Enzyme design. Structure first.
Site, PDB file in Angstrom:
ATOM      1  N   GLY A 175      56.379  75.577 -15.793  1.00 14.46           N
ATOM      2  CA  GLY A 175      57.100  76.391 -14.819  1.00 14.46           C
ATOM      3  C   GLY A 175      57.499  77.741 -15.394  1.00 14.46           C
ATOM      4  O   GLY A 175      57.391  78.765 -14.720  1.00 14.46           O
ATOM      5  N   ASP A 176      57.959  77.753 -16.643  1.00 20.54           N
ATOM      6  CA  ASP A 176      58.230  79.007 -17.350  1.00 20.54           C
ATOM      7  C   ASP A 176      56.956  79.864 -17.445  1.00 20.54           C
ATOM      8  O   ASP A 176      56.999  81.093 -17.323  1.00 20.54           O
ATOM      9  CB  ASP A 176      58.770  78.728 -18.752  1.00 20.54           C
TER      10      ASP A 176
ATOM     11  N   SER B   5      56.542  74.863  -7.089  1.00 21.52           N
ATOM     12  CA  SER B   5      55.514  74.289  -7.952  1.00 21.52           C
ATOM     13  C   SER B   5      55.506  72.760  -7.867  1.00 21.52           C
ATOM     14  O   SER B   5      56.559  72.121  -7.753  1.00 21.52           O
ATOM     15  CB  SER B   5      55.686  74.753  -9.398  1.00 21.52           C
TER      16      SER B   5
ATOM     17  N   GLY C 275      49.572  71.407  -7.783  1.00 18.06           N
ATOM     18  CA  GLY C 275      49.483  72.865  -7.641  1.00 18.06           C
ATOM     19  C   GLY C 275      50.762  73.512  -7.173  1.00 18.06           C
ATOM     20  O   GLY C 275      51.800  73.391  -7.822  1.00 18.06           O
TER      21      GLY C 275
ATOM     22  N   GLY D  24      53.730  70.415 -10.004  1.00 16.38           N
ATOM     23  CA  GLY D  24      53.012  69.860 -11.147  1.00 16.38           C
ATOM     24  C   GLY D  24      51.514  69.801 -10.887  1.00 16.38           C
ATOM     25  O   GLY D  24      50.902  70.813 -10.539  1.00 16.38           O
TER      26      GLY D  24
HETATM   27  N1  LIG Z   1      50.016  67.794 -15.096  1.00 14.39           N
HETATM   28  C1  LIG Z   1      49.556  69.006 -14.697  1.00 14.39           C
HETATM   29  N2  LIG Z   1      48.237  69.234 -14.466  1.00 14.39           N
HETATM   30  C2  LIG Z   1      47.776  70.439 -14.062  1.00 14.39           C
HETATM   31  N3  LIG Z   1      48.579  71.509 -13.869  1.00 14.39           N
HETATM   32  C3  LIG Z   1      49.925  71.419 -14.072  1.00 14.39           C
HETATM   33  C4  LIG Z   1      50.502  70.131 -14.501  1.00 14.39           C
HETATM   34  N4  LIG Z   1      51.829  70.311 -14.629  1.00 14.39           N
HETATM   35  C5  LIG Z   1      52.086  71.602 -14.302  1.00 14.39           C
HETATM   36  N5  LIG Z   1      50.956  72.269 -13.972  1.00 14.39           N
HETATM   37  C6  LIG Z   1      50.851  73.697 -13.544  1.00 14.39           C
HETATM   38  O1  LIG Z   1      52.051  74.426 -13.844  1.00 14.39           O
HETATM   39  C7  LIG Z   1      52.761  74.736 -12.642  1.00 14.39           C
HETATM   40  C8  LIG Z   1      54.255  74.517 -12.842  1.00 14.39           C
HETATM   41  O2  LIG Z   1      54.445  73.191 -13.330  1.00 14.39           O
HETATM   42  P1  LIG Z   1      55.753  72.329 -12.962  1.00 14.39           P
HETATM   43  O3  LIG Z   1      55.685  71.109 -13.845  1.00 14.39           O
HETATM   44  O4  LIG Z   1      55.874  72.199 -11.465  1.00 14.39           O
HETATM   45  O5  LIG Z   1      56.965  73.288 -13.459  1.00 14.39           O
HETATM   46  P2  LIG Z   1      58.436  72.815 -13.959  1.00 14.39           P
HETATM   47  O6  LIG Z   1      58.671  71.409 -13.468  1.00 14.39           O
HETATM   48  O7  LIG Z   1      59.380  73.893 -13.461  1.00 14.39           O
HETATM   49  N6  LIG Z   1      58.398  72.748 -15.711  1.00 14.39           N
HETATM   50  P3  LIG Z   1      59.454  73.666 -16.764  1.00 14.39           P
HETATM   51  O8  LIG Z   1      58.757  74.977 -17.038  1.00 14.39           O
HETATM   52  O9  LIG Z   1      59.533  72.797 -17.992  1.00 14.39           O
HETATM   53  O10 LIG Z   1      60.720  73.829 -15.970  1.00 14.39           O
HETATM   54  C9  LIG Z   1      52.159  73.815 -11.593  1.00 14.39           C
HETATM   55  O11 LIG Z   1      52.331  74.277 -10.255  1.00 14.39           O
HETATM   56  C10 LIG Z   1      50.714  73.721 -12.035  1.00 14.39           C
HETATM   57  O12 LIG Z   1      49.972  74.879 -11.638  1.00 14.39           O
HETATM   58 MG   LIG Z   2      61.291  74.521 -14.270  1.00 17.44          MG
END
Ligand SMILES: Nc1ncnc2c1ncn2[C@@H]1O[C@H](COP(=O)(O)OP(=O)(O)NP(=O)(O)O)[C@@H](O)[C@H]1O
Ligand SMILES: [Mg+2]
Ligand SMILES: Nc1ncnc2c1ncn2[C@@H]1O[C@H](COP(=O)(O)OP(=O)(O)NP(=O)(O)O)[C@@H](O)[C@H]1O
Ligand SMILES: [Mg+2]
Lengths: 318, 313
Positions: free
Chosen positions: A261-262, A230, A235, A232
C-alpha cells in the site's frame, strides 16, 4: 545537467518514525536469555517506505516529519546513506524503537508509543511546513499522529497545502482518517484498503462492486477527487470524481505484501506529480504494489520487472 | 593529583526494558512506559562510585549513535568518561518483563578490529598516570584477542595501579593463567565453582579449598559473594566470613557490581580488611533494596554497615 531550483518535488511526511529492530531467532526461549548475532536495524515508518520507493522510481523527493535524539540521528544517517534528501523538525523527545521477533513461524512485535510533541514543536513544524510549500508540488502523508498533537493536526497541514494549490495524497486509517474526512480541507487522494474502508463506515466488509460504489459515494467522502481502495491480490477499485474504475491484475509469486500500500501511494504520488491520466496512474500504483509483494523486503521494488506487470493490468469503467 | 578510579566497559549496551501485562506471541504488543539505559556491568560500577562521591572516569569502547546515547546519559549524571570510538555500532539488549518472567535478547555486538584494539591499548597507557585503581567488569566484545585483559592488566602492573576484576568463565581463566595478576577478583559462589568445573558447595572447608587452588596463585584478594548470605574472602593467608542481616529485597541484580564499587573505593583509600569487606557488602545490600540496578541510598549506609559481622575463619 543543472540542479533544479523550482517546485518540481514530492514532500513525504513521517510524523512518527521508528528505529525498527528485527530479531530472527531459531527459538524464543521465554524466561531465558536469547543470544542473537544477525540483528537488522532500519529506518522505519510508512512515510519512509513511500520515500524509498519514490527514490527507486527516480522522482525528486524530500522526507520530513519529527525526529528526536540519537535514534532520530540514526534515521537521518540511513537516509544519507541512500542519498535521500530530508528536512525533519528536531524535537526534544526521543524517536522510538519498534521490535520484531521472528521465531518459529511467528512474528512477535513490541511497538512503542514514542515521543510527545510539545506545543512549541507542533507550532514550529507548521511554520517549517509552510516554508516548504514553494518548493514542492505534491505531499504524501502516511501513518498516525504521535502523542501530544491536536486531533486536527493533519487537517491543519492539509489546509496549508490547499492554500498553495498543492495536492495531498493521504494514507491513514480509523479515527485519524475520520477526523480528516469531517474537516472542510480535503486530501486529493485517499488510499484505504477494503478493510480500512468498511471499518471506517462501521458496516460489514463486502467485496461486491455495487456495495463498493455505495461505500465510496457516501457524504463522508465528499470533496475527495480520488478514492483508491486497494484489494490486495484482487487489485483495486477506484472512484475519480464521478467515474468508477475496477483494476484487474495478474496472479504473481508473493513473498511479503507488507508495504504494498505504501508502494501504491508512491505510485499514485509519482503519477499526480507528473499529471498522468487515470489509466496510467492506476496502473503505476498497482504495478508498484505488486512489485513490492514479490519482494522479501518492505517498501522495495525491482523495476526490471515493471513493464511486464504494467502491460497485464486491465482498467475498466464499471 | 591522580586520586581517581578508572572503570572499563569494553562491551556496553543500550538496554531496553519492556514491562508488559502479557507477552502476546505472534501478535502486536503496545508499550508506553519504556526505560532505556546505558548498560554494562562496568557502567553499574561507575554509577555507584559516582553516587558514593568517589572520583571516577569511565572508559571502554563505544560506536555510532548508540555510543553517543551512552556518553549523553553519563553527561546527564555528571559522570566523566574517556571512551575509545569504534567503526561498529554499540549494541542494544532487550529485557521483556511479563507474567512473572524475564525474557531477554542479547545482541553479540560490534567486532573490534586490529587497529582499534591496538589503538585502545595506547589510549589506556596514556591514562595510567591519571588514576590509582582500575575496575574491570564483563566479557570481551567480538574480535578481541583472548589475551586482551592480560594485555590491559600488564599495563596496570607496569605502573603499580591495582586491578579489581569481575569476569567469569574462559575469560577469567585466561587472566588467571597469565603472569600479570589482578589485585582483587570478585566471583559469586556459582562463578567460582563453574570456573573450577566442580559442584557448588557452600561449606567453609570447600570454599577454603577452592580459593586456595594453584589457579588463584598470586592474587591478593579473592572475594566470593554469596548473595543474601554475605561473603567469603581470602586476603593473602587470612580467610574471612562476612555475615549480614536479612533485609527487604526488591532487585539484587547489580549487587555484585555495587560490591565491586565498594572494593575499589576501599582499595583507593587504603582501608583496612574489615572496612573494605563491610563497605563492599553494605553497597551490595543497599543495591538489593532498590528496584533500580546499580543504585544505592547512602542515607541508609551507616545502619547496615553497623550490622555487618566480619570473622577470621
Ligand atoms: N498478494 C498480492 N498479490 C498481488 N498484488 C498485490 C498483493 N498484495 C498487494 N498487492 C498490490 O499492492 C496493492 C496494495 O496492496 P494492499 O495489501 O491492499 O495494501 P495495504 O493493505 O495498505 N498494505 P501496507 O502498505 O502494509 O499498508 C494492491 O492493490 C495490489 O496491486
Ligand atoms: Mg496500508
Ligand atoms: N538478597 C540479598 N539480601 C541482602 N544482601 C544481598 C542480597 N543479594 C546480594 N546482596 C549483597 O550484595 C553482594 C553481592 O551480591 P551477589 O548476588 O553475590 O552478586 P552477583 O552475583 O555478582 N550479582 P551482579 O552484580 O548482578 O553480577 C552480596 O555479597 C551481599 O552483600
Ligand atoms: Mg556479578
Amino acid at each position: 545537467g543543472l540542479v533544479p531550483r523550482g517546485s518540481h518535488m514530492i514532500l513525504t511526511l513521517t510524523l512518527n518514525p521508528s528505529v525498527d529492530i528485527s530479531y530472527p531467532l531459531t527459538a524464543l526461549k521465554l524466561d531465558d536469555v536469547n543470544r542473537v548475532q544477525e540483528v537488522s536495524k532500519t529506518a522505519g515508518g510508512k512515510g519512509l517506505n513511500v520515500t524509498r520507493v519514490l527514490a527507486q522510481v527516480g522522482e525528486p523527493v524530500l522526507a520530513s516529519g519529527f525526529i528526536g535524539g540519537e535514534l532520530g540521528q540514526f534515521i537521518a544517517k540511513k537516509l544519507d546513506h541512500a542519498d535521500i534528501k530530508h528536512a525533519f523538525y528536531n524535537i526534544k523527545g526521543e524517536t522510538r524503537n519498534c521490535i520484531a521477533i521472528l521465531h518459529e513461524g511467528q512474528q512477535t512485535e513490541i511497538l512503542e508509543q514514542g515521543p510527545e510533541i510539545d506545543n512549541q514543536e507542533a507550532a514550529g513544524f507548521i511554520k517549517h511546513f509552510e516554508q516548504m510549500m514553494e518548493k514542492v508540488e505534491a505531499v504524501a502523508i502516511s501513518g498516525s499522529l504521535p502523542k501530544g498533537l491536536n486531533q486536527d493536526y493533519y487537517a491543519q497541514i492539509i489546509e496549508r497545502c490547499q492554500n498553495k494549490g498543492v495536492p495531498v495524497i493521504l494514507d491513514c486509517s480509523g479515527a485519524t482518517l475520520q477526523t480528516v474526512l469531517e474537516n472542510p480541507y480535503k486530501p486529493t487522494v485517499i488510499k484505504p484498503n477494503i478493510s480500512e474502508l468498511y471499518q471506517l463506515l462501521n458496516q460489514p466488509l463486502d467485496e461486491s462492486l455495487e456495495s463498493l460504489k455505495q461505500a465510496v459515494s457516501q457524504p463522508l467522502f465528499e470533496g475527495i477527487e480520488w478514492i483508491i481502495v486497494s484489494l490486495g491480490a484482487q487489485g483495486a477499485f477506484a472512484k475519480h470524481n464521478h467515474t468508477f474504475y475496477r483494476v484487474n491484475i495478474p496472479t504473481i509469486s508473493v513473498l511479503n505484501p507488507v508495504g504494498s500500500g505504501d508502494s501504491t501511494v508512491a505510485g499514485i504520488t509519482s503519477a499526480i506529480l507528473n499529471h498522468e491520466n487515470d489509466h496510467d496512474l492506476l496502473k503505476k500504483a498497482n504495478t508498484l504494489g505488486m512489485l513490492n509483494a514479490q519482494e522479501a523486503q518492505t517498501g522495495y521494488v525491482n523495476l526490471n520487472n515493471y513493464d511486464d506487470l504494467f502491460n497485464q493490468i486491465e482498467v475498466l469503467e464499471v
